[PDB]
Write a protein that binds this ligand. Structure first.
Ligand SMILES: [Cl-]
Ligand SMILES: [Cl-]
Ligand SMILES: [Cl-]
Length: 57
């Protein structure tokens, strides 16, 4: 369902692993989902069709 990776603060992207490959998707521009901290964990949720670059911990 959920595919994990790390985000780029400079580019506001999430690079996630799926099917043995890395995929780079823009993070949201929303304040509490964008990449605020370089290399923060991020997730692509394939069920909900959404990205978050401020995943909880
Ligand atoms: Cl790859
Ligand atoms: Cl915007
Ligand atoms: Cl806020």
């Amino acid at each position: 369902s959920k595919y994990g990776g790390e985000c780029s603060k400079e580019h506001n992207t999430c690079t996630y692993r799926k099917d043995g490959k890395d995929h780079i998707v823009k993070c949201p521009s929303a304040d509490n989902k964008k990449c605020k901290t370089d290399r923060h964990h991020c997730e692509y949720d394939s069920y909900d069709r959404k990205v978050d670059c401020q995943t909880p911990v």
